[PDB]
């Protein structure tokens, strides 16, 4: 009750009670960590969310980043479970925190989940990513974030300041920076954050592993069915410029 009101560095939050068969869990869903990457900020690195007045409504997942929605087998569970379950919006840089209900009196290790999706799709809100059972079972704090996908996350004209590539990865790093500064308000221990992610989420984990500015934001890493060195997970500079120029041609841009 008073366990559902929490103040992080940029303002107050109101979370929700999630029930499980083992007992309840405190959840804070849809916390802004970046200013909306919109208009002139499309394709640019994310900027930290500035502070806000009042209490943010953190009781349900915020929007899904704009992505292609798969239509091979319409209405079929094996494909729909990976499709967006919120509205699409470029305004999507929000993260979620699950924490054991009796907020741990001692600092708990924290797991941070990076969803996969080929770098073109995915959302932290999918039912298959619900952190409530992992928290209630192992009494650990769990965080997940959205990050721009497709052209919005990874279109690149290498060398230019206006579309520099990899901003989806930079969304992820910003959320890791948010955990470092704020997870301690939910009972988490910033000195024990474990990254984990599946498929392109796993390749993402690999890259924070190999990027010195990310490597102070986590202590250990879990890679499920993916690696940064796979044939699909990176592209050359010349090839990225070649695909960005073709997208602009197909869309009418001289």
């Amino acid at each position: 009750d008073a366990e559902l009101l929490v103040t992080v560095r940029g303002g107050r939050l109101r979370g929700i009670r999630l029930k499980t068969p083992g007992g309840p869990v405190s959840a804070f869903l849809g916390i802004p960590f970046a200013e909306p990457p919109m208009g002139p900020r499309r394709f640019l690195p994310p900027e930290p969310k500035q502070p806000w007045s009042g209490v943010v409504d953190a009781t349900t997942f915020q929007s899904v980043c704009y992505q292609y929605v798969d239509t091979l087998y319409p209405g079929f569970e094996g494909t729909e479970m990976w499709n967006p379950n919120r509205e699409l919006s470029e305004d999507c840089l929000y993260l979620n925190v699950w924490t054991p209900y009796p907020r741990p009196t001692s600092p708990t290790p924290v797991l941070v989940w990076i969803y996969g999706g080929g770098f073109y799709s995915g959302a932290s809100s999918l039912d298959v990513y619900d952190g409530r059972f992992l928290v209630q079972a192992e009494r650990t704090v769990l965080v997940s974030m959205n990050y721009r996908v497709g052209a919005f996350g990874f279109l690149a004209l290498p060398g230019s300041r206006e579309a520099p590539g990899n901003v989806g990865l930079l969304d992820q790093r910003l959320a890791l920076q948010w955990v470092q500064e704020n997870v301690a308000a939910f009972g988490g221990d910033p000195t024990s954050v474990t990254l984990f992610g599946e498929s392109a989420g796993a390749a993402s984990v690999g890259m924070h592993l190999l990027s010195p500015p990310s490597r102070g934001l986590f202590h250990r890493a879990v890679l499920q069915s993916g690696a940064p060195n796979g044939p699909w997970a990176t592209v050359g500079m010349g090839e990225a410029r070649r695909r960005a120029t073709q997208l602009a041609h197909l869309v009418g841009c001289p």
Partner: protein
């Protein structure tokens, strides 16, 4: 002020987001499965060099890593572009469908290079058995894209100061909606690691909830201590660390832990060691 690159992006920013999505798949260099248009770029900024180069030359003492794959990585992708494949039949492909499936699964690769794939992956006693060829293509795609990349990374972290644990996830969810021939497809361990079977509404079996409670414990433990095992339970089946020599991993399924050696060692020598040499000398 205009230059020309700034011109390009300024225009792209005027388009509605939907307009950009509806042309995304159209920029791929050729027909392919398990390829995506806008992925991380090796630009020298975020990634100071290619991920491969960084791995080979990096020092990883003080790091614990937990990695793994599912039994049938490739099967899911085949239904999105390989000839003859569908969720809705047995996908018993012909040999000519198989050879064509190899050019789609391994795109951007020379004729000689795809001969070498057909060499490794066909059963020259039964070159045309359709079931055998379905599994072969499933292995070509899943090996080339997931397993041998993972196994290459894992051997190198381990050999260069990391402390690595590896699994093969090989339980097929009792609730799985994909057809049987796909086995345990890409992404279908996630349910269990997030303990979804614990959800009363999803109709999982009783033994399956135990399995998820088990798996959450391995994952929590690793988070907690960089070691999935239980410290005070020595007599429980130990998960040994993957090393480049002994290449030990465990099988995660309903049976107690079992140790195996070699993450498709024979295949991954082709993909990680010989194929690169072949593309260079031709």
């Amino acid at each position: 002020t205009g230059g020309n690159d700034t011109e390009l992006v300024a225009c792209l920013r005027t388009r509605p987001a939907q307009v950009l999505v509806n042309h995304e798949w159209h920029v791929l260099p050729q027909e392919s499965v398990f390829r995506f248009s806008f992925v991380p770029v090796v630009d020298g900024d975020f990634l100071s060099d290619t991920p491969e180069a960084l791995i080979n030359a990096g020092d990883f003492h003080g790091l614990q890593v937990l990695v793994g794959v599912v039994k049938d990585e490739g099967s899911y992708f085949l239904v999105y572009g390989a000839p003859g494949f569908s969720k809705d039949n047995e996908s018993l492909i012909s040999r000519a469908e198989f050879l064509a499936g190899v050019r789609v699964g391994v795109p951007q690769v020379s004729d000689l290079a795809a001969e070498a794939v057909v060499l490794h992956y066909t059963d020259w006693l039964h070159p045309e058995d359709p079931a055998r060829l379905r599994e072969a293509l499933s292995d070509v795609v899943g090996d080339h894209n997931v397993v041998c990349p993972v196994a290459q990374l894992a051997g190198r972290l381990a050999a260069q100061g990391a402390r690595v644990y590896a699994y093969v996830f090989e339980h097929r969810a009792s609730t799985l909606s994909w057809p049987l021939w796909m086995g345990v497809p890409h992404g279908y361990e996630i349910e269990f690691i997030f303990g979804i079977p614990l959800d009363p509404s999803r109709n999982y079996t009783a033994e399956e909830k135990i399995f998820a409670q088990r798996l959450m414990r391995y994952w929590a433990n690793f988070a907690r201590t960089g070691d999935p095992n239980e410290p005070r339970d020595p007599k429980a089946p130990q998960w040994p660390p993957y090393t480049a020599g002994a290449q030990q991993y465990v099988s995660l399924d309903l049976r107690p832990l079992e140790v195996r050696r070699g993450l498709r060692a024979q295949a991954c020598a082709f993909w990680n060691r010989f194929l690169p040499k072949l593309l260079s000398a031709t």
